[PDB]
Design a protein around this motif. Sequence first.
Motif, PDB file in Angstrom:
ATOM      1  N   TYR A  91       0.837  -1.187   0.000  1.00 36.59           N
ATOM      2  CA  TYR A  91       0.000   0.000   0.000  1.00 36.59           C
ATOM      3  C   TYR A  91       0.876   1.242   0.000  1.00 36.59           C
ATOM      4  N   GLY A  92       0.343   2.309  -0.572  1.00 38.47           N
ATOM      5  CA  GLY A  92       1.067   3.562  -0.653  1.00 38.47           C
ATOM      6  C   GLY A  92       0.280   4.537  -1.492  1.00 38.47           C
ATOM      7  N   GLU A  93       0.753   5.775  -1.504  1.00 33.60           N
ATOM      8  CA  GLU A  93       0.070   6.811  -2.256  1.00 33.60           C
ATOM      9  C   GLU A  93       0.193   6.546  -3.753  1.00 33.60           C
ATOM     10  N   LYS A  94      -0.549   7.330  -4.527  1.00 32.05           N
ATOM     11  CA  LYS A  94      -0.620   7.125  -5.965  1.00 32.05           C
ATOM     12  C   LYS A  94       0.751   7.277  -6.609  1.00 32.05           C
ATOM     13  N   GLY A  95       1.083   6.336  -7.487  1.00 39.83           N
ATOM     14  CA  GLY A  95       2.298   6.421  -8.282  1.00 39.83           C
ATOM     15  C   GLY A  95       3.585   6.327  -7.496  1.00 39.83           C
ATOM     16  N   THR A  96       3.564   5.651  -6.352  1.00 38.03           N
ATOM     17  CA  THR A  96       4.746   5.503  -5.516  1.00 38.03           C
ATOM     18  C   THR A  96       5.596   4.295  -5.886  1.00 38.03           C
ATOM     19  N   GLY A  97       5.113   3.420  -6.766  1.00 35.67           N
ATOM     20  CA  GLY A  97       5.901   2.310  -7.257  1.00 35.67           C
ATOM     21  C   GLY A  97       5.555   0.949  -6.695  1.00 35.67           C
TER      22      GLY A  97
ATOM     23  N   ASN B 265       8.069  11.956  -6.233  1.00 33.52           N
ATOM     24  CA  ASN B 265       7.110  10.919  -6.587  1.00 33.52           C
ATOM     25  C   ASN B 265       7.571  10.227  -7.865  1.00 33.52           C
ATOM     26  N   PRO B 266       7.746   8.901  -7.879  1.00 29.80           N
ATOM     27  CA  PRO B 266       8.255   8.249  -9.098  1.00 29.80           C
ATOM     28  C   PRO B 266       7.412   8.487 -10.339  1.00 29.80           C
ATOM     29  N   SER B 267       6.086   8.468 -10.214  1.00 28.53           N
ATOM     30  CA  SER B 267       5.234   8.622 -11.387  1.00 28.53           C
ATOM     31  C   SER B 267       5.267  10.048 -11.916  1.00 28.53           C
ATOM     32  N   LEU B 268       5.189  11.035 -11.020  1.00 30.97           N
ATOM     33  CA  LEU B 268       5.261  12.424 -11.453  1.00 30.97           C
ATOM     34  C   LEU B 268       6.617  12.734 -12.065  1.00 30.97           C
ATOM     35  N   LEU B 269       7.692  12.219 -11.468  1.00 31.19           N
ATOM     36  CA  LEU B 269       9.021  12.446 -12.024  1.00 31.19           C
ATOM     37  C   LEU B 269       9.152  11.814 -13.400  1.00 31.19           C
ATOM     38  N   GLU B 270       8.655  10.589 -13.562  1.00 30.67           N
ATOM     39  CA  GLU B 270       8.715   9.945 -14.869  1.00 30.67           C
ATOM     40  C   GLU B 270       7.927  10.731 -15.911  1.00 30.67           C
ATOM     41  N   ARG B 271       6.724  11.182 -15.557  1.00 26.11           N
ATOM     42  CA  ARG B 271       5.916  11.934 -16.508  1.00 26.11           C
ATOM     43  C   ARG B 271       6.565  13.264 -16.866  1.00 26.11           C
TER      44      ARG B 271
END
Lengths: 208, 352, 80, 326
Positions: free
Chosen positions: B81-87, B341-347
């Motif tokens: 479990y974790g926040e959105k887009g944390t991996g 945030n991994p997802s925000l950084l990737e985007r």
Amino acid sequence: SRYSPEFKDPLIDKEYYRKPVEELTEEEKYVRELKKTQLIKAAPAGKTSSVFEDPVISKFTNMMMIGGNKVLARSLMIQTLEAVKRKQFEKYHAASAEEQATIERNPYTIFHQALKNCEPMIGLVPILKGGRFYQVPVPLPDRRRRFLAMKWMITECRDKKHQRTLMPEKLSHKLLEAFHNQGPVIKRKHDLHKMAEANRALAHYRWW
Amino acid sequence: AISRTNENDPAKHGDQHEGQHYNISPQDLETVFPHGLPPRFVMQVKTFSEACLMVRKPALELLHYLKNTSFAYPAIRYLLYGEKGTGKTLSLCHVIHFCAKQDWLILHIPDAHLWVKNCRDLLQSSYNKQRFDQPLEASTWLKNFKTTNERFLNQIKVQEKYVWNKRESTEKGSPLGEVVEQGITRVRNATDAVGIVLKELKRQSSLGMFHLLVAVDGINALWGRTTLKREDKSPIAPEELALVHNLRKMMKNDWHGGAIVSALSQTGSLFKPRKAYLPQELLGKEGFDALDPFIPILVSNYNPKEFESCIQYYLENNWLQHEKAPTEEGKKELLFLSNANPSLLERHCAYL
Amino acid sequence: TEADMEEYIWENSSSERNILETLLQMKAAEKNMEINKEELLGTKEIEEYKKSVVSLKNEEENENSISQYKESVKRLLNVT
Amino acid sequence: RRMPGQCSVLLFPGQGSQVVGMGRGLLNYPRVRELYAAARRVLGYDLLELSLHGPQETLDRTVHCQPAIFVASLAAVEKLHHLQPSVIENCVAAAGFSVGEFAALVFAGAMEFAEGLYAVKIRAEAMQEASEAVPSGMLSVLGQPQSKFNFACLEAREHCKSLGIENPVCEVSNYLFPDCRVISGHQEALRFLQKNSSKFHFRRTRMLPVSGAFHTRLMEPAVEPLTQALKAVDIKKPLVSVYSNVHAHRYRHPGHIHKLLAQQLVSPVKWEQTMHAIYERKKGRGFPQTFEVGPGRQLGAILKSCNMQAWKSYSAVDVLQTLEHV
Ligand SMILES: Nc1ncnc2c1ncn2[C@@H]1O[C@H](COP(=O)(O)OP(=O)(O)OP(=O)(O)O)[C@@H](O)[C@H]1O
Ligand SMILES: Nc1nc2c(ncn2[C@@H]2O[C@H](COP(=O)(O)OP(=O)(O)O)[C@@H](O)[C@H]2O)c(=O)[nH]1
Ligand SMILES: [Mg+2]
């Protein structure tokens, strides 16, 4: 306007303020002292001091806007840049050792050069007298030609002949075509340059 | 190459490999992950021509728990479990890749939210007329389950006679592959073929023939609501779907010889607010009661070392083309705008 | 068409039933013959587990409470 | 006065929606087997077998498709009543395209199954006869803002006047949605239109697979048979607002359905005007639910073209399968 005439526009450049006092000319020094007195407007939402800020891409995004939907316009812009980047990486990975040195992968370089390839040098301005509007060739200002390149790109990408092809993919393809001096936008520039040479009779009116 | 690790065997990653990327081979990518990886990570794999995953504390902890698992005790539920887009999805993929190399039998559900929304071909099950079938969704899963577990389909053999039609049946002792094939050829029997497979894997693993990993992403779908409707436009409950009913039995810890690893996901969820990420909030009372007792594992944003190594990996792939991105000020701006945030950084890095 | 609602009580609850079932199975696997469902439920680990579960069910769910639940469950299931 | 959204509008399809497998998914529903039994009793052959499994070439023949569509439409109404009684209870309008009109009246309590089906049979047979009488056909055309339809019809007649034939026929036959029409008449006219599409500014052109030129004066011989068939029938007052295809308005008194149902046979179908009459309203006003009781989903597409906001609340009754075995 809700701002008084006194209020001046802000200067968001970040390296301007760090310029050492020694390099300041007397004129620049006087301007710096004069801005101390003036009232300054609040910076608008948009431009910031960020190093990834690009005014040309911001203006392109604003010109794609419909109904104040800035989130969607910026989403489309970033999707287009990502698509250009991915297509160039695709072409670079399949290219020979000697063709890889000439493949541009920076989407910003491609965007700027593509828009530069679409800028016209001459246009036509109508002028009124005798009841007959007269079309005189005119050298376009820099602002006008920069605007026309963007407007032609966006109108070309909004053409209804592109059925269900999404705007990011159409725009990336058009940008990559213009990067190589091909496509309908370059032809629209050429058809204005030819229709201004076809009418060099009134070529010397300098007072449009 | 400070952001890479030469140790590409997930059985040997430890706390000294934290923050470093290891490469998954193309053969492993095709066999282990036909369906698992996030939609936006396969784009990176296709553009970089390689699939490199960072090693992080969540996956390392979950691998430590799976190395010291007792195969005689009932299966232990581990919940990422974790926040959105944390991996958390790629943490689950790391764990699945570890287990697949160790000859575990992988039961990977890549996204359970797809089974409770946007279903066009919904049938009424002939086996049980009070449940509904999803042939397009079950046959799609059977092909990838066959791909991942091609080796075992001949070794594992059924222990009952299964009757598909008055003409066609699977006789006791046939290889499990036949059942899978019966679901891939005639889609009418896809949903019945999935349940049988589950019913076999849950049983034979208890006998000790193999170790079974039940990997379910977006497990919060199973005890929530659906957006599927009848012909009279009435709502359908999740337990009325045979595909969802059969997968709940696997989450119960009434079998041994394996582990149950799962990840929550608000993305794709139904009737959950955007900022809900905690286990009870996403699972519901029913979901928490079902999974209880379980071990929750937290996935957070990148810490400074992981963030620096992720940007170094992107720089090594030349994926940051802006001239200011390599600089320290560009790194601080990426850090602020993504907040690690991994997802925000990737985007953000995608279009720079 | 009346309806009734109340707080969480661990006794006669699904969490109690599930943990009891799991511990009976763990003892069976251990080969121990200890099925007294008061001896199993009167340990200190069960006290901490029920405290964590009742907290999660009655008070707010934060990460501190999730971690307390995690540690109680780990101690009960012999995970380290 | 119910808010738009509680009430319902039933749309009945017409020619061209026939498909093999029609009726399965409706049989086990109440009262449908009896309807097909009555269809046998009136027609003289087993409609059920032909609709369920047929070569599709017998089913494409005019004498068979229209009764099949009529019976399937009423069966679909029965199924919709079974699933959602409130939908049938709160019905405000009804409309059919060419032969579906006969279904709509039967649904509205203006006619009965036996008399309506006999009328449909006579209509289909007479139309087929008139179709063999002179070669004729139908062509669907989608135009541009620069397209002229009456103009194209005029040269389509000029060509075959130069060839030489008595009072050649080529006129717009179906108004179905903006810039999309169906023209009817002699093959040579429609052939001329196909090859002069570019001159006439037609984006797309598609021959309809029909026997002849429906809804034109070429079907004049078929008026008198059907006319007689409607004399014995006693039409009552429609219970719901049933909309006509001749002038695209509600049927107001029962004493005019007799002649409008025969004038429709040789008059263009005003489907676009009917959609405007049923759905046009001020921006922001809600729309009723819409149910296409019958085979196919063509009227759904036509409604989508005509009025998107009305189409948002559109659904079709499926006549090829059923989710639950009743
Ligand atoms: N361990 C990792 N190694 C490499 N990249 C990662 C890792 N974790 C996350 N990422 C990056 O973050 C992106 C999103 O991660 P992921 O899909 O795992 O998120 P998630 O937390 O499961 O999200 P959601 O809430 O949507 O299910 C991945 O596409 C990848 O770009
Ligand atoms: N058509 C068919 N399906 C079967 C058969 N056996 C098992 N299945 C399927 O595999 C699943 C096995 O689940 P099960 O443990 O038996 O639960 P239960 O059927 O509800 O009691 C069922 O949901 C069926 O869909 C069989 O003999 N014939
Ligand atoms: Mg995920």
